[PDB]
Ligand binder design. Structure first.
Ligand SMILES: *[C@@H]1O[C@H](CO[C@@H]2O[C@@H](C)[C@@H](O)[C@@H](O)[C@@H]2O)[C@@H](O[C@@H]2O[C@H](CO)[C@@H](O)[C@H](O)[C@H]2NC(C)=O)[C@H](O)[C@H]1NC(C)=O
Ligand SMILES: *[C@@H]1O[C@H](CO)[C@@H](O)[C@H](O)[C@H]1NC(C)=O
Lengths: 99, 8, 274
């Protein structure tokens, strides 16, 4: 069975420039399990991202969290890029700090 | 503590 | 209230690229607490919650040995299922298992479960009675018959009623400061313009634990569950959770809509408006 991932990007706290926070990319509702998830700062891969919270739902779809500590600034931009077989090309979702 | 699974 | 111990197990083959990937992830309630991943450099069972520092080295050695044995059993199972389903050795396939138990506030068993899937579809499951199995197809019926002659349901029931319950009680005792806490949600509403003189109102709930929460939007006292958009409750990286729910309303009439938040940490539910 093939299910395309839902990709959600969000911070732990409402963003405040200069204040430490956590950035999250939650990738959910996907199958098969093989997947590549990258967090990006200004277009560059963020090193040492933590993967956690792997689980599956009642319909067997996979869920997993990528997260990293960060301190927002006015100019820095963040995104999450995902590669999965259900998608011909990679999908990138941007952090929308005003959502 | 987890279970020791039985083969299918 | 009630509490659960659950293990999520996945085995995924990758022909041409070596042995299958094998992972086990354990949760107490909504909190990840242990993990095993075969793709790590030196695969071992590892703590994922701070309170698991309270187990001694023997715990880790024993769980590691069990996980390595399980990894080998699932590698065989992937091969077995190729036979049952008459599939080639060149394609990737997945086995998933969810196993665990739930206890009440008094620590006594409420329910136990074990369910398997192959390639994302139901395969075999323990019935609520903890005595019989239900099989989704003829392949699983082969497994059912094997398990019946091996006395597997008795073995599993002994684990569910014994080990699982006893260890869950221990984890709740050791991890009480984390597991028995309540972190109250903090809420706010954002506003976004749309075409056609309408506005999106989004109600956010942040920083809460446990994960169960209810967010609703109301107009004139009636809930608008039909018109709402939302996301599933999601982890925020530090052991707390977040959620949002939105509604589209007419421009100029925003003040008539209210967001309601219900949670264990809110003695009186929150009511907010833009
Ligand atoms: C959580 O429970 C502890 C008591 O449990 C013991 O310490 C835990 C960390 C864990 O290792 C358990 O397995 C232990 O059995 C509470 O600590 C005590 O509470 C009472 C009442 O205030 C006090 O008389 C004791 O001296 C405390 N014990 C210690 C060792 O400090 C603790 O309050 C609980 N935490 C929360 C926040 O609920
Ligand atoms: C198994 O698949 C082969 C093709 O690879 C087919 O010829 C055969 O009919 C199948 N066997 C059975 C009994 O389904």
């Amino acid at each position: 069975i093939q299910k395309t991932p839902q990709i959600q990007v969000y911070s732990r706290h409402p963003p405040e420039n200069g204040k430490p926070n956590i950035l999250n990319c939650y990738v959910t509702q996907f199958h098969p399990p093989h997947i590549e998830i990258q967090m990006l700062k200004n277009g560059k891969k963020i090193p040492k991202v933590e993967m956690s919270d792997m689980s599956f739902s009642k319909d067997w779809s996979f869920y997993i969290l990528a997260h990293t500590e960060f301190t927002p600034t006015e100019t820095d931009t963040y995104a999450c890029r995902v590669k999965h077989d259900s998608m011909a090309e990679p999908k990138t979702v941007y952090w929308d700090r005003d959502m | 503590r987890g279970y020791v699974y039985q083969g299918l | 209230g009630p509490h659960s111990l659950r293990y999520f197990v996945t085995a995924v083959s990758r022909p041409g690229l070596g042995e299958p990937r094998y992972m086990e992830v354990g949760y107490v309630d909504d909190t990840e607490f242990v993990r095993f991943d075969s793709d790590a450099e030196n695969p071992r069972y590892e703590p994922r919650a701070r309170w698991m520092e309270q187990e001694g080295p023997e715990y880790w050695e024993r769980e590691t040995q069990k996980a390595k044995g399980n990894e080998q059993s699932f590698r065989v199972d992937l091969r077995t299922l190729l036979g049952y389903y008459n599939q080639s050795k060149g394609g990737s396939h997945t086995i998933q298992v969810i196993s665990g138990c739930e206890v009440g506030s008094d620590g006594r068993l409420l329910r136990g479960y074990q369910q398997y899937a192959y390639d994302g579809c139901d395969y075999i499951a323990l019935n609520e009675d903890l005595k019989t199995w239900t099989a989704a197809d003829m392949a699983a019926l082969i497994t059912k018959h094997k398990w019946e002659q091996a006395g597997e349901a008795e073995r599993l029931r002994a684990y569910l009623e014994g080990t699982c319950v006893e260890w869950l009680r221990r984890y709740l005792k050791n991890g009480n400061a984390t597991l028995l806490r309540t972190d109250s949600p903090k809420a706010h509403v954002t506003h976004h313009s749309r075409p056609e003189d309408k506005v999106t109102l989004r109600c956010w709930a942040l920083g809460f634990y446990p994960a169960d929460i209810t967010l609703t939007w109301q107009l004139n006292g009636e809930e608008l569950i039909q018109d709402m958009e939302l996301v599933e409750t999601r982890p925020a990286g530090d052991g707390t959770f977040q959620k949002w729910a939105s509604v589209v309303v007419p421009l100029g009439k925003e003040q008539y809509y209210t967001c309601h938040v219900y949670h264990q940490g809110l003695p009186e539910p929150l009511t907010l408006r833009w």
